Write a protein that binds this ligand. Structure first.
Ligand SMILES: [K+]
Ligand SMILES: [K+]
Ligand SMILES: [K+]
Ligand SMILES: [Mn+2]
Ligand SMILES: [Mn+2]
Ligand SMILES: [Mn+2]
Lengths: 519, 519, 519
């Protein structure tokens, strides 16, 4: 029989835990891993968004690497419209967050000359001249290649390698002429317009926060986005610049630093301290450093974020092949599962959702794999190691959290209900990775939206006004969670859930926990 | 500084181990994970095979789902030709195994318009008719489809699902008429000729070993293949049938059962006992059972095989996208890494090698990821577990093996040298997963070839005749290993390696171990 | 069924390990814990010594706190006579070590006055005056008590507590007059002659090595003792002074620092570095510092010594009550068991052997408890933890040790045979605590005698001359071990043992191990 890999949960070793994984051990209804969907022409329509939400989407990511403000404003407007089309039912309403992915220090090449083939082919052992002559800005070809990085020449050297499109195409500088570069094509073949360019071994002096960026972040504040995915941040200083720009009015916007180059990996510790969360941007990371090493950086990053208690996102190409096909490849399914097992708080879709033919099938697939992997976690082991690395604490919530999660493990609670406004308490509970869903009730619409960044936290926005008597106000928000839970099939009348509340309205966190029957 | 994730090797927890993975901790030269390549039109040429070998190929897999005997006979002949082109040098000669992959109980739709390239769409609602009438055999079109499985009507029901062409296409039986099925198209769109068919929730009664299979196995014995990849085996009886056909003359051919359907996963334990090894055929497995659960089956299978000490292979779509591209996707790189970390003895390529545009790049990539992940393993923990999970033990080689690997850990030996003929002693040493390469010297050309099925065993065929004095014959095979090692850059004069030999010529295994300087 | 707590050895937790200890799981014949017997009037007779040996004695301790040199010389002569009375049989001969226990900076009282033997009573709340006037030297009573510590007035002050006769009697300095001390009796009652005195809260300026000491050590060198138990050593410097006096001629005499005061416990680390071994002298230690804290110091000491690989002895009052009774108390039995379980290499008897009515019964009891507790160890857990404290940093012989011990666990070897002259190789094997007996064959009579200091090493002196051929000389010393083992009931023809030898005569340690049948 058994359910949600409970037999394997009892194992005393990882080897036995693995040997006990059962494909016939049904996972639970609730899904703990937040799904982040990148919105594009394939999913901008309010009607598709509505389905995006029912299928699982928690975070709508706007990639400011392309598109104008009015563009992104309309799409932001549509996700909100689709979201609120549900607001009518307080029990079935699923909050949805809006994220903003910075363009950052990108290098991009121009448009191929119209006058000639659709795409130019850089054949191995062929010459190619890279120029900055704005004249060739839209007249690229097998001979001339224009880039949008002016100082490029001062940071590269003879012998330096240049990667272009998703470092599918490789170039080697042979002559470093003043204001231009004569190179030789090593790899790749076909080149299109506006393609990504990477200088792995160089020190790109572009700004962390460029003019263009400053305006986009400002725009986010204006548009009231919940988070910011800062691209190519390579040190604490960068995070701080982004923090400063968001300034006072955007103080509450959570900054998620994207790690996508050797520098950022090397200075990860100081970056994590300055950020609210981290994103393993495997795409550029896999170009900036050898592809075979990404898995190392991913696990290291997810590991340290877990230990720190800050959200971490795994992104890029997870279900890549589903851009053109309805079902994922065996490796891609594996990729998602291992990301969840590695400890990732959220998994992302960018392309499979932005411009793919199967956006809805893709999020549904991550949703399926998520629940399955989440159950295959070795909680007993993870908890212990995670509490070990928990320094001596003068913060009582950490204790409440560990006690509660432990309590949830013992009575196989159906869920952990947490009343919070800043979201802190719930964040703490999620940190110690309980198996059961963390139903966080709050009146702060934003902390609800931001809650998705945390593994296990199921945000529930309470719209009822604050009751006179604190006890009644509590039983109110608690019953709301109870109902949402019954509605979502997380638990029925008679199951056990642990409830974390504040003893008195003035309590600075959840200092009260109870084991309670759902009825 | 550090090398081969040794700093992270010292951690006491998995969380710390992960937090310590360093992308600047260079792996070692030696690669322990065997690479199995599926040979096809893109890699049959002797010249390509030569490069296949230099790039890392250890096992050539002939997929008998297609091709005639003379076809596979020539390709087998070519891999041997390319292999022997190296025989001349005893030190740099890498033996290559030949593997035969069985067709088994497959279900294939017939031809379309009696033509190779096929058309016809389908998509939702579109009713489709599945006839068994061998008349319209080679006349499949948009409305009537023919299957090569005759009893298909007795094993399926109304409402049953039928997957066509790698589960991309989905049908649902609406009317189960006698000798034909009227179905409705759920998923899928375009169907070609002779495409695979799967009946997920049905009990297919086809024969474990068919008439077609019997001749192919017989042929394998004739061609002297080292192993058989028994497709779709679902129980011990199945393995035994294959064992019987190979019979006495093929007694030494190792049988690798392929697990690719619910039944096989369910009866896995008895199948493992009857087999010499196991292959996680995620392809059909991901169709036969929900895709999201494959990762569960994989980890469970790899785990149990490790515990049992029999070789286990992970296969299908690992570097899939590389069939059309020079670099893999981030998910695919991750998939290989986790396969090695899960503990798979060999990883496979089938298509990326058989008919892709980048066969060489693909094996080279697995080779790269393999070494990287092999170092990222948590040996201390693994060993302890493999040990604390090795019930009983009277096979002294177990003792010798565990003590030697433990000794190799302590003095960070560069390699373990094992003299063996049946290969048993080396198998035992690999079982306990040393970090260093296992250089197994043997005069039994076949055990050398078969050795690749084991993680870490680097086979070396000794051609020198047996010396008069046992001591000299030993020091001879040992120096050959010493030389092979120095040549392959596994170690230089002065490094330490542990040597496992037999005290006297009559010893039944490796009962003598030594810590020795390589010089 | 089961034997030697092997069922409990399979447990994965200490709690389970304990819950599985079975009083019906017969321990093995061999005893790994060395037994150190203090020789006195109750056991100086050669005839008693002979029985002391057959009963289990490994080390004869001569306590130079009393007796003249001619006295100790005769007793040393008798143990040697009793020991050699067995030398005739090379197989049944058990070497015995002679240990010299230093007097050190002791503080003794004088002889009660001549009254009718009537010992003196010190009722609570009485005065009593301690003088130094060498006139009361043999005339102590209720009013005056002489001390042999001349500078006692300069180290104590008013309020200072003074303990007499094994801390049984308590006195508090009320008036610190010049050259005397007026005190008040807190505890204690009856005072005899020449009793022990402790100033726990003072800084005794007596010489670590006194005039009396230097001569005694010199004598030890002359008498060729195997080890020295240096009393009250409180710092590295102390150990060095002793090392220096033993000088060049006594360079091979192992120095065992005795930890018996707060200072020694506080500076333990530097003392252990300088010593060859350590003795937890609970006697004075339990006076110098609170009684309830000794168990902490013992475990800590035994712990760090284990971690360092140096012999550690537990001593004093273990079977105390047996001085007058044939059977030990329940606490004493427990005390011996827990000492073996703590990890003590040797357990001592001093009094129960020196002047008790049941010297033989006492050593026999320690012998019985030892084997019983040695089986009740949690080897799996202990080993894993020792290996951790021994990083991957290598000397090389410890690789062999760890590998060998691991191998002995796996095939449940009957014993580990080690050929060594300096004894080093065996010491290393013992360090990693195997379950089976370590039969160490040597031609160095002394290293054999000293070997007893190490848990599990069963010394065997080889008298045969060195064979021409290194191979024959090895099989010779191995067969001797094989024979000794069969004789002692350690193992019969057909059992498995691991043999650690040197490949070539020049090897600097045991670099060759083998799993071999005993026959
Ligand atoms: K971007
Ligand atoms: K096949
Ligand atoms: K003494
Ligand atoms: Mn990027
Ligand atoms: Mn298949
Ligand atoms: Mn003492």
């Amino acid at each position: 029989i058994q359910t949600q890999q409970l037999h394997a949960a009892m194992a005393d070793t990882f080897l036995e835990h693995m040997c006990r994984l059962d494909i016939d051990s049904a996972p639970i209804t609730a899904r703990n891993t937040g799904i982040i969907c990148t919105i594009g022409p394939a999913s901008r329509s309010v009607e598709t968004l509505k389905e995006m939400i029912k299928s699982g989407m928690n975070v709508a990511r706007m990639n400011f690497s392309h598109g104008t403000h009015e563009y992104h404003a309309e799409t932001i407007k549509n996700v909100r419209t689709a979201t609120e089309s549900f607001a009518s039912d307080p029990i079935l309403y699923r909050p949805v967050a809006v994220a903003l992915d910075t363009k950052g220090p990108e290098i991009r090449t121009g448009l191929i000359k119209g006058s000639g083939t659709a795409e130019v082919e850089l054949k191995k052992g062929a010459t190619l001249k890279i120029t900055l002559d704005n004249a060739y800005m839209e007249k690229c070809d097998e001979n001339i290649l224009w880039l949008d990085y002016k100082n490029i020449c001062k940071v590269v050297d003879v012998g330096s390698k240049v990667y272009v499109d998703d470092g599918l195409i490789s170039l080697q500088v042979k002559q470093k002429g003043p204001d231009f570069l004569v190179t030789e094509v090593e790899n790749g073949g076909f080149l299109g317009s506006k393609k990504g360019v990477n200088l792995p071994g160089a020190a790109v002096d572009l700004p962390a926060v460029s003019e263009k960026d400053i305006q986009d972040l400002k725009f986010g504040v204006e548009q009231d986005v919940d988070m910011v995915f800062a691209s190519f941040i390579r040190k604490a200083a960068d995070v701080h610049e982004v923090r400063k720009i968001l300034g006072e009015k955007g103080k509450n916007i959570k900054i998620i630093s994207k790690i996508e180059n050797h520098e950022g990996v090397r200075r990860f510790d100081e970056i994590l301290e300055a950020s609210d969360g981290i994103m393993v941007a495997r795409g550029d990371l896999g170009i900036e450093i050898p592809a075979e090493k990404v898995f190392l950086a991913q696990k290291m990053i997810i590991g340290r974020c877990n230990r720190a208690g800050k959200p971490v996102i795994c992104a890029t190409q997870m279900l890549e092949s589903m851009i053109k096909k309805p079902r994922p490849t065996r490796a891609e399914g594996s990729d998602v599962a291992n990301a969840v097992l590695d400890g990732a708080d959220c998994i992302m879709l960018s392309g499979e959702t932005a411009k793919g033919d199967y956006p809805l099938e893709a999020v549904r697939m991550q949703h399926l794999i998520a629940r399955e992997a989440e159950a295959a976690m070795f909680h007993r082991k993870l908890f212990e190691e995670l509490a070990r690395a928990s320094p001596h604490s003068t913060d009582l919530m950490e204790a409440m959290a560990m006690g509660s999660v432990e309590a949830s493990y013992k009575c196989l609670a159906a869920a952990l209900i947490v009343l919070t406004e800043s979201g802190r308490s719930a964040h703490q509970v999620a940190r110690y990775r309980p198996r059961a869903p963390i139903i966080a009730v709050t009146r702060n619409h934003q902390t609800a939206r931001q809650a998705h960044l945390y593994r296990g936290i199921f945000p529930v926005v309470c719209k009822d006004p604050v009751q006179e008597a604190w006890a009644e106000d509590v039983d109110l928000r608690v019953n709301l969670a109870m109902n949402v839970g019954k509605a979502r099939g997380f638990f029925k009348k008679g199951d056990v859930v642990i409830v974390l509340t504040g003893w008195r309205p003035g309590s600075g966190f959840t200092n009260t926990m109870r084991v309670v029957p759902v009825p």
